[PDB]
C-alpha cells in the first residue's frame, strides 16, 4: 500500500488527459498566429513541405540522419510507382559521435559529418557521383524554405557550440566546401516526424500525421495554408512541425509535474526546456524509474533501504531496462538479471515493486503522449466537414515500437479522446532515410 500510494502519484484520470489535450490545442493555435508565434511554447514551425500537385525526380539519393545516439548516411533509390513514388534504402552506414566532437563547435561537428560522408562514398565507389542530398535533422528549425532554416536550440543532450541561430544547411554546405573531396546538392532539410509521415503517405494517402516516440518525442501534421500565418498563401496544406516536446515550458503542465520530473529537468542539459518530452522520451524514462526506485529505498520499501553504487549513478537505469522489466513473464528472471547487473540482490517483492514502478512511468508516458496526438487529431477534425474523420498516423521510435505495452495503452487512450475519428497507425520502414529522399525528389524539380 505504501509503495502503491507513491506510485498512485503517476495516475492520470480521463479529465486530466482532456485538460492536457485542451491546453495542447490552445498552445498549437497560439504557435500558428503571428501575434503569439514568438512567445509560444509549442512553436508550430512551418516545414515548407506542401501537399504537392505532382512533379518528382527519379533515381538514387543520399540521405543523412542526425538526431539519434549516432549518425547515419544512406543511399535511397526513388522511382515512379502506382501511388506515385516507390523508395528503397539500398546502402547504409552508421557512425558514432565522439565526446570531443559533441562538446566541440558546429564546424567541428559538421566537418566530422562531412568526413563520415567521404568514408561512405569511398567505401561504395560513388565519390565521382553527384547525388542530391536529403537531410533528416531531428531538432527545432525555423525554416525560410525547404533547404534553408536556422537551428533554434539543441534538444536531447546535444551541445555543439556556435550551431544555434545559424543555417544548418549553410553549416553542412560550408563543411563540404572545407573538404573538397566530394560535392553534394543539399536539396532538403526535414524533421524526423516529417520524414516518417512522407514515407508512410505512399503506403496510405490518408497519412497526414507523423509522430516520433524514441529518444525524444514530437509530432507533425498537415495544416490548412490559411492557418499557417507564418507563410504566404491560402491554398492547399503545409506540414507543420509542432515541436510539442516543449509543451509545459510556459507552465502548462505544472499541476502534473512530480518530484522525479523536477529532478530529471534540473540535472538535464536543457533545464526548463522540453518538459512534455521529459515525461515521455527514452532519454528520460529509465531515469524517471531510477529516481522512483531511489525514493522507495530512502523510504525503506525497496532493497531493505540499500541502493547499489550503480543505482545511485545518473543514467544507470537504461530505458531498454523498463521495456525488459515489463517483458518479464512472471518468473522474475528478466527483472532479477537486470537488477543483479545493477549490483543489487533483489527479493521476489523487490522485483514486483520494480515492475510496478516501470509500469507507472511507462503508462503515464503513453497517456501523456495520447493527449498530445488527440489534440492534433481533434484540431484537424475541427478544420474539416465530414461525418467521421478517417486519418492515418505514421509512427517511429524505439519506445513506441519496442516497449511491450506502450503502443496498445497509447492507441486505446487516443481512441478514447478522439470520438468520430477513425485512426489508423502505421510504422515507418526506414522512414527517416526514405522520407528525406522522397521530399528531395519533389524539391529537385525546382532547384537542381
Ligand X SMILES: Nc1ncnc2c1ncn2[C@@H]1O[C@H](COP(=O)(O)OP(=O)(O)OP(O)(O)=S)[C@@H](O)[C@H]1O
Ligand Y SMILES: COc1ccc2ncnc(Nc3ccn(C)n3)c2c1
Stretch that binds ligand Y, among 16-24, 42-50, 176-184, 402-410 (CB under 6 A): 42-50
The DSSP line for 126-184 is: -TT--PEEEEEE-S-EEEEETTEEEE----TT---BT-TTSBHHHHHHHHHHTT-S---
Cβ(291)–Cβ(257) under 8 Å?
A: no
Which listed residue (43, 111, 147, 156) is catalytic? 156
| Buried residues in 22-38 as b, exposed as e (16+ CB within 10 A) | ebbbebbebbbeeeebe
DSSP state of 277: G
Q: Which of residues 175-194 bind ligand X (CB under 6 A)?
A: 192
357 interacts with, out of ligand GLC, Na ion, ligand X, none, CB within 5 to 8 A per kind = none
Does 155 appear as a known binding residue?
yes
Which listed residue (192, 261, 328, 350) is catalytic? 192
156 annotated active-site = yes
Backbone angles phi and psi of 38, in degrees to 5: -75, -45
Question: Applying CB under 6 A, does 334 fall inside the site for ligand X?
Answer: no
Question: Applying CB under 6 A, does 320 fall inside the site for ligand X?
Answer: yes
Question: Applying CB under 6 A, does 277 fall inside the site for ligand GLC?
Answer: yes
Q: Which residue is nearest to ligand X (CB)?
A: 214
For residue 116, the surrounding DSSP H or E stretch is helix 106-122
Q: How far apart are CA 108 and CA 101, in angstroms?
A: 6
Sign of CA dihedral 243, 245, 249, 250: positive
Residues in contact with 200: Cβ distance below 8 Å, sequence separation at least 6, in sequence order: 207, 210, 392, 394, 426, 428, 431
Nearer Cβ to ligand GLC (66/351): 66
Question: Applying CB under 6 A, does 395 fall inside the site for ligand Y?
Answer: no
Nearer Cβ to ligand GLC (138/440): 138
> Given phi > 0 = left and psi -120 to 50 = alpha, else beta, which region is 413?
alpha
Stretch that binds ligand X, among 181-189, 209-217, 226-234, 332-340 (CB under 6 A): 209-217
Own/partner long-range contacts of 320-324 (Cβ < 8 Å, ≥24 apart): 320/286, 320/398, 320/402, 321/286, 321/289, 322/285, 322/286, 322/289, 322/358, 322/361, 322/362, 322/403, 323/362, 323/399, 323/402, 323/403, 323/404
Among 31, 46, 132, 216, binds ligand GLC (CB under 6 A): 216
265 annotated active-site = no
- Residue 281 CB, shortest distance to ligand X, in Å, is 7
Backbone angles phi and psi of 48, in degrees to 5: 75, 15
Nearer Cβ to ligand X (245/248): 245
Q: Which of residues 237-296 bind ligand X (CB under 6 A)?
A: 282-283
- Residue 439 CB, shortest distance to ligand Y, in Å, is 5
Does 218 appear as a known binding residue?
yes
Q: How far apart are CA 316 and CA 39, in angstroms?
A: 36
CA 242 from centroid of its chain's CA atoms: 11
Nearer Cβ to ligand Y (95/425): 425
Q: Which of residues 379-438 bind ligand X (CB under 6 A)?
A: 397-399, 402-403
Question: Applying CB under 6 A, does 191 fall inside the site for ligand GLC?
Answer: yes
CA-nearest of 57, 56, 55, 59 to 77 is: 59
Q: Which of residues 81-110 bind ligand X (CB under 6 A)?
A: none
- Residue 226 CB, shortest distance to Na ion, in Å, is 5
Q: How far apart are CA 196 and CA 436, in angstroms?
A: 9
- Residue 343 CB, shortest distance to ligand GLC, in Å, is 32
Cell of 357: 514502478
> Residues within the annotated binding site?
65-70, 138-139, 155-156, 191-192, 215, 218, 243, 277, 282-283, 319-323, 398-402
Known binding site for ATP: residues? 65-70, 215, 282-283, 319-323, 398-402
Contact residues for ligand GLC, defined by CB under 6 A = 67, 138-140, 155-156, 191-193, 212, 214, 216, 218, 243, 245, 277
The residues binding ligand Y (CB under 6 A) are 48-52, 146, 198, 201, 208, 222, 438-439, 442-443
Q: Which residues fall in the annotated binding site for substrate?
A: 138-139, 155-156, 191-192, 218, 243, 277
Residues that bind ligand X (CB under 6 A): 67-69, 138, 192, 212, 214-216, 282-283, 318-320, 323, 397-399, 402-403
Amino acid at each position: 500500500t505504501l509503495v502503491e500510494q507513491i506510485l498512485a502519484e503517476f495516475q492520470l484520470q480521463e479529465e486530466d488527459l482532456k485538460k492536457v489535450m485542451r491546453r495542447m490545442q490552445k498552445e498549437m493555435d497560439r504557435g500558428l498566429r503571428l501575434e503569439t508565434h514568438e512567445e509560444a511554447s509549442v512553436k508550430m514551425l512551418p516545414t515548407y513541405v506542401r501537399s504537392t500537385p505532382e512533379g518528382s525526380e527519379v533515381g538514387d539519393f543520399l540521405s543523412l540522419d542526425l538526431g539519434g545516439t549516432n549518425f547515419r548516411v544512406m543511399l535511397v533509390k526513388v522511382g515512379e510507382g502506382e501511388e506515385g513514388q516507390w523508395s528503397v534504402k539500398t546502402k547504409h552506414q552508421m557512425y558514432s559521435i565522439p565526446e570531443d566532437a559533441m562538446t566541440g563547435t558546429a564546424e567541428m561537428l559538421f566537418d566530422y559529418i562531412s568526413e563520415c560522408i567521404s568514408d561512405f562514398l569511398d567505401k561504395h565507389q560513388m565519390k565521382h557521383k553527384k547525388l542530391p542530398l536529403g537531410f533528416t535533422f531531428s531538432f527545432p528549425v525555423r525554416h525560410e524554405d525547404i533547404d534553408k532554416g536556422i537551428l533554434l536550440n539543441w534538444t536531447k543532450g546535444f551541445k555543439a557550440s556556435g550551431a544555434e541561430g545559424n543555417n544548418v544547411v549553410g553549416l553542412l554546405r560550408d563543411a563540404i566546401k572545407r573538404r573538397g573531396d566530394f560535392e553534394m546538392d543539399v536539396v532538403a532539410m526535414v524533421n524526423d516526424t516529417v520524414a516518417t509521415m512522407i514515407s508512410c503517405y505512399y503506403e496510405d494517402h490518408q497519412c497526414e500525421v507523423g509522430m516520433i516516440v524514441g529518444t525524444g518525442c514530437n509530432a507533425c501534421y498537415m495544416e490548412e495554408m490559411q492557418n499557417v500565418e507564418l507563410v504566404e498563401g491560402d491554398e492547399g496544406r503545409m506540414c507543420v512541425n509542432t515541436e510539442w516536446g516543449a509543451f509545459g515550458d510556459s507552465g502548462e503542465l505544472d499541476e502534473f509535474l512530480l518530484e522525479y520530473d523536477r529532478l530529471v529537468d534540473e540535472s538535464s542539459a536543457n533545464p526548463g526546456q522540453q518538459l512534455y518530452e521529459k515525461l515521455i522520451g527514452g532519454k528520460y524514462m529509465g531515469e524517471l524509474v531510477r529516481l522512483v526506485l531511489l525514493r522507495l529505498v530512502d523510504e525503506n520499501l525497496l532493497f531493505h533501504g540499500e541502493a547499489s553504487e550503480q543505482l545511485r549513478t545518473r543514467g544507470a537505469f537504461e530505458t531498454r531496462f523498463v521495456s525488459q522489466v515489463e517483458s518479464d513473464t512472471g518468473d522474475r528472471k528478466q527483472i532479477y538479471n537486470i537488477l543483479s547487473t545493477l549490483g543489487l540482490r533483489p527479493s521476489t517483492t523487490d522485483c514486483d515493486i520494480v515492475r510496478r514502478a516501470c509500469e507507472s512511468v511507462s503508462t503515464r508516458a503513453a497517456h501523456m503522449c495520447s493527449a498530445g496526438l488527440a489534440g492534433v487529431i481533434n484540431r484537424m477534425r475541427e478544420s474539416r466537414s465530414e461525418d467521421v474523420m478517417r486519418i492515418t498516423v505514421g509512427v517511429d521510435g524505439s519506445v513506441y515500437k519496442l516497449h511491450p505495452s506502450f503502443k496498445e495503452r497509447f492507441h486505446a487512450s487516443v481512441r478514447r479522446l478522439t470520438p468520430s475519428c477513425e485512426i489508423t497507425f502505421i510504422e515507418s520502414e526506414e522512414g527517416s532515410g526514405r522520407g528525406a529522399a522522397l521530399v528531395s525528389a519533389v524539391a529537385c524539380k525546382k532547384a537542381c
